[PDB]
Nucleic acid binder design. Structure first.
Ligand SMILES: Nc1ccn([C@H]2C[C@H](O)[C@@H](COP(=O)(O)OP(=O)(O)OP(=O)(O)O)O2)c(=O)n1
Ligand SMILES: [Ca+2]
Ligand SMILES: [Ca+2]
Ligand SMILES: [Ca+2]
Length: 902
DNA sequence: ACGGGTAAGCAGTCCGCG
DNA sequence: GCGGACTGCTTACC
């Protein structure tokens, strides 16, 4: 037996015992109960010397505890006295650290990941899990070990009796009277019909004991499915039987009970719930107009809506065959989405790295508390007691005020992982604080005028001095996560570059039948592959393109989420629930960044005045925290439309000017700033990102800024990737906002593409056609979106109260128009909503209306709102005002002037 | 309780203004 | 009868 080391699955604390589920050395799943004996520490005199020193070198003495409750009355007793009680007071983590004293290398094929969704017919409307009034009438449950979809289908219920489900009919196309259940899963569905609900649940509980999930997921499974099936079994069989959903027989019900409802969260000891919706909100870097599975599915996977007739509420009685097919597809849908985004994998990686419960990957603070503590166990150090602190504003990034205008030629540069780098460069840590110095005003450091803070320590322009010689835990531990990011980024950019090869190739689609190639898209297509691609068919290239984008999304996920974590350690230092919170360090970081950016603004202005020849002229037109945006018009003039054959030539050129002259200069400038602050290590690595301009010989303006955080740019090269066709990089404007209607986002963007690529005549032409045709766009397409908070607070007898938002006012008028009948869907406090304006003297008695997003409005009122919609207002408010924004800034009109020729 | 600050633009109210 | 300054709210950007 020359083989693998054990690895935990879950862990819990009940009283004076730890409940752990793990995978042993022969790969079998197990449970133990352990009366863990923890150790906390206390200071002692300089003399009682030993192993343990706090992070400041103050000696400490370790204390046996008999059990965990015994060590907790000690932490309370030490506060009753008023001395610091050191050590890790979350014992699940100490236990994990004690048991798994090594880099955990873990096998996912051995971890049970279950994915489920239920269906619960209600003619009452939305079925609150806290009550669970209504029968659970279908469950689908996918198990990653077995690799099967277990279907529990209830044929008999007070809401209707139905025929068994046919897997043959599910397989067939929609077009053949079937449900289009993906055939790569037909062979994996185990189907189980049932007499009656009781019999189905009892069988589901027995199924769960045999195949108890470790990671439990699915869509919206924390706030609906789990608590509904808990409360349901609890109402029908009793708590005892309900507690079966826990492998340890412990649940918690914490009440948190709306402004008037009964929403509880239910925790199942010994299971790690990773609600995919929470994973998606945290790790996907999107902001969506709706978070229904239909919606997100169609966004991530480009699959269809998933249609049907009648309202979902009467669906099981009318087409039970589809009701079940749809439940199965929903579960698979989440799998399809996880196969793209890979957030489960992320979570496992991250979680086993820190040695935490996996559901603690939602908490950067947990995540770092544990990494840091593991890193300090190692050197026999003892961690601080966490302290109460009052909350406190403090300053962040600098942002240059730009002159609103157009900018023909732009070229950007940005610093690598800024704040993480600053920590590394400066050696910022709880335990590396040397002292302070007398701080001169910020600009004196920017202008390289103020006295050198210190000769011996590493400094930040907020007055902090750090030990330059030793190693900080934080810097150390952030360097390890940064190095993993570097690598996954590499794969992702490669993947992106490889995709542009493929897109170029798609104007030579070679009339032929082939299969796609066999390459590893994380690495730069070696020349022989590149030559092979030039001969392939569309069918084939297209399959490679799609495979590349899945490889790149994979890498994006891994990369941007380590960026998230490290930037989140920075954040934690400004958050009072973090054991190492310190505004001294938070501000050392932001203030140094303020300086860094401004310092290099001054520099880049200097160098480009020297070499361009001119003097005291603005070359940096904008910048945000780590960014600079340099006007390259004068670098181009220096040649002209002389020997530039095509759009690519000057792009080749600039790429070359930046890489061969500017980044050398920039490195010189920052090396000098590091000498000034006497930092530990030079890590201000500013390289080039974007390269933007009109196509050659165009009327296109290349770029514009309206104000801070609001610009567009027509970009030909980004971080080394040369685009096949130019890509708009729009930051801040209305095209990028989830609040603005899809159709206008589309339109506003095509307008921008025209301003930037095909001057003023192109815009005005297209604008004319948007104005005429705008009125027959589908209403869902031209509605606004808003989050819906504090509805209750602005109610006041069915009507708008003092200071009531337009969108909240919208819901109130919905609530008035569906008043009475429970048939129609309710707007949920906190969710999102569509929003249309209404004309003068409409039947709804108000100037707009709102319904919950991702849906068609109720049929009840649909035909009325469609005919009372105010397109006039729609277009002025959401298209025109924004457009005037963009064109004012860039010195342009969208409508032909009063010619004076006339 | 459970990463951070910065900043834009929309709408509502309350006030000055022949 | 309406514009601007202030404020609450939403959603972007690092
Ligand atoms: N959610 C975020 C995003 C950014 N930032 C801060 C920390 C970043 O270091 C700094 C610069 O932002 P960037 O968006 O340019 O990201 P980075 O510089 O960290 O990494 P990179 O540009 O290599 O992707 O802004 C942050 O604190 N939190
Ligand atoms: Ca950066
Ligand atoms: Ca940046
Ligand atoms: Ca970069």
């Amino acid at each position: 037996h020359g083989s693998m080391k054990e690895f935990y699955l879950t862990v819990e604390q009940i009283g004076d015992s730890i409940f752990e589920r793990y995978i042993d050395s022969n790969g079998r799943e197990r449970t133990r109960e352990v009366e863990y004996k923890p150790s906390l520490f206390a200071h002692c005199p300089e003399s009682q010397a030993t192993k343990y020193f706090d992070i400041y070198g103050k000696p400490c003495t370790r204390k046996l505890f008999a059990n965990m409750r015994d060590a907790s009355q000690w932490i309370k007793r030490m506060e009753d006295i008023g001395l610091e009680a050191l050590g890790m007071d979350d014992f699940k983590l100490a236990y994990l650290s004690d048991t798994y004293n090594y880099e955990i290398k873990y096998d996912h094929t051995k971890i049970r990941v279950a994915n489920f969704d239920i269906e619960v017919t209600s003619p009452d409307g939305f079925p609150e899990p806290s009550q669970a009034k209504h029968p659970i009438d279908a469950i689908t449950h996918y198990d990653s070990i077995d690799d099967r979809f277990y279907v529990f289908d209830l044929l008999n219920s007070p809401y209707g009796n139905v025929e068994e489900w046919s897997i043959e009919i599910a397989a067939k196309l929609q077009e053949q009277g079937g449900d289009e259940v993906p055939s790569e899963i037909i062979d994996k569905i185990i189907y189980m019909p049932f007499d009656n609900e009781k019999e189905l649940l009892m069988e589901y509980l027995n199924f769960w004991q045999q195949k108890t999930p470790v990671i439990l997921t699915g869509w919206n499974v924390e706030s609906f499915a789990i608590p509904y099936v808990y409360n349901r079994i609890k109402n029908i069989f009793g708590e005892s039987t309900a507690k079966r959903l826990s492998p340890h027989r412990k649940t918690r019900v914490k009440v948190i009970e709306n402004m008037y409802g009964s929403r509880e969260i239910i925790t199942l000891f010994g299971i790690s719930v990773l609600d995919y919706i929470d994973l998606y909100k945290k790790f996907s870097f999107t902001n969506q107009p709706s978070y229904s599975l239909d919606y997100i599915s169609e966004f991530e996977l480009n699959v269809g809506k998933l249609k049907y007739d009648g309202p979902i509420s009467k669906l099981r009685e009318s087409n039970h065959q589809r009701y079940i097919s749809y439940n199965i597809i929903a579960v698979y849908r989440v799998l399809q989405i996880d196969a793209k985004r890979q957030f489960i994998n992320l979570s496992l990686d991250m979680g086993y790295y820190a040695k935490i419960q996996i559901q603690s990957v939602f908490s950067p603070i947990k995540t770092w508390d544990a990494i840091i503590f593991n890193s300090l166990k190692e050197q026999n150090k003892v961690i601080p007691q966490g302290r109460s602190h009052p909350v406190q504003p403090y300053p962040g990034a600098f942002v240059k005020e730009p002159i609103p205008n157009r900018y023909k030629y732009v070229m950007s540069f940005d610093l690598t992982s800024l704040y993480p780098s600053i920590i590394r460069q400066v050696n910022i840590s709880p335990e590396t604080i040397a002292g302070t110095f007398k701080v001169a005003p910020l600009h004196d450091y920017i202008n390289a005028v103020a006295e050198r803070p210190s000769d011996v320590y590493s400094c930040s322009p907020n007055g902090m001095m750090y030990y330059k010689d030793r190693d900080g835990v934080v810097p150390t531990e952030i360097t390890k996560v940064f190095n993993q990011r570097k690598e996954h980024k590499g794969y992702m950019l490669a993947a992106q570059r490889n995709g542009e090869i493929i897109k170029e190739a798609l104007h030579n689609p070679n009339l032929s039948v082939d299969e796609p190639l066999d390459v590893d898209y994380r690495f730069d297509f070696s020349d022989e592959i590149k030559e092979k691609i030039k001969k392939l068919s569309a069918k084939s290239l297209n399959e490679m393109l799609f495979r590349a984008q899945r490889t790149e999304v994979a890498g994006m996920t891994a990369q941007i989420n380590r960026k998230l974590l490290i930037n989140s350690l920075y954040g934690a230092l400004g958050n009072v629930w973090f054991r190492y919170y310190d505004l001294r360090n938070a501000t050392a970081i932001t203030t140094f960044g303020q300086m860094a950016l401004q310092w290099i603004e001054r520099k880049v202005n200097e160098y480009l005045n020297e070499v361009c020849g001119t003097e005291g002229e603005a070359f940096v037109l904008y910048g945000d925290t780590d960014s600079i945006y340099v006007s390259a018009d004068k670098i181009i003039d220096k040649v002209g439309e002389s020997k530039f054959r095509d759009t690519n030539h000057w792009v080749d050129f600039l790429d070359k000017f930046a890489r061969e002259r500017m980044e050398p200069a920039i490195d010189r400038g920052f090396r000098e700033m590091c000498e000034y602050m006497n930092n530990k290590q030079h890590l201000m690595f500013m390289d080039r990102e974007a390269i933007a301009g009109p196509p050659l010989g165009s009327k296109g303006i290349g770029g514009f800024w309206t104000g801070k955080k609001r610009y567009a740019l027509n970009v030909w090269d980004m971080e080394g990737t040369r685009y096949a066709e130019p890509k708009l990089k729009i930051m801040g404007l209305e095209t990028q906002k989830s609040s603005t209607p899809k159709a206008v986002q589309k339109a506003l963007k095509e307008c921008i593409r025209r301003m930037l690529q095909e001057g003023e005549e192109s815009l005005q032409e297209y604008f004319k056609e948007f104005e005429k045709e705008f009125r027959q766009l589908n209403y869902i397409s031209i509605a606004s979106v808003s989050s819906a908070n504090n509805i209750a607070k602005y109610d006041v007898g069915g009507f708008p109260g003092p200071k009531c938002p337009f969108h909240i006012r919208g819901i109130l008028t919905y609530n008035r128009a569906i008043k009475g009948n429970i048939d129609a869907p309710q707007v949920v406090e906190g969710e999102k909503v569509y929003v249309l304006p209404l004309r003068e003297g409409n039947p709804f008695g108000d100037k707009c209306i709102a319904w919950p997003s991702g849906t068609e409005i109720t049929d009840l009122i649909k035909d009325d709102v469609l005919h009372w919609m105010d397109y006039t207002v729609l277009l002025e408010k959401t298209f025109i005002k924004p457009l005037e924004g963009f064109t004012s800034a860039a010195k342009l009109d969208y409508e032909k002037k009063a010619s004076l020729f006339d």
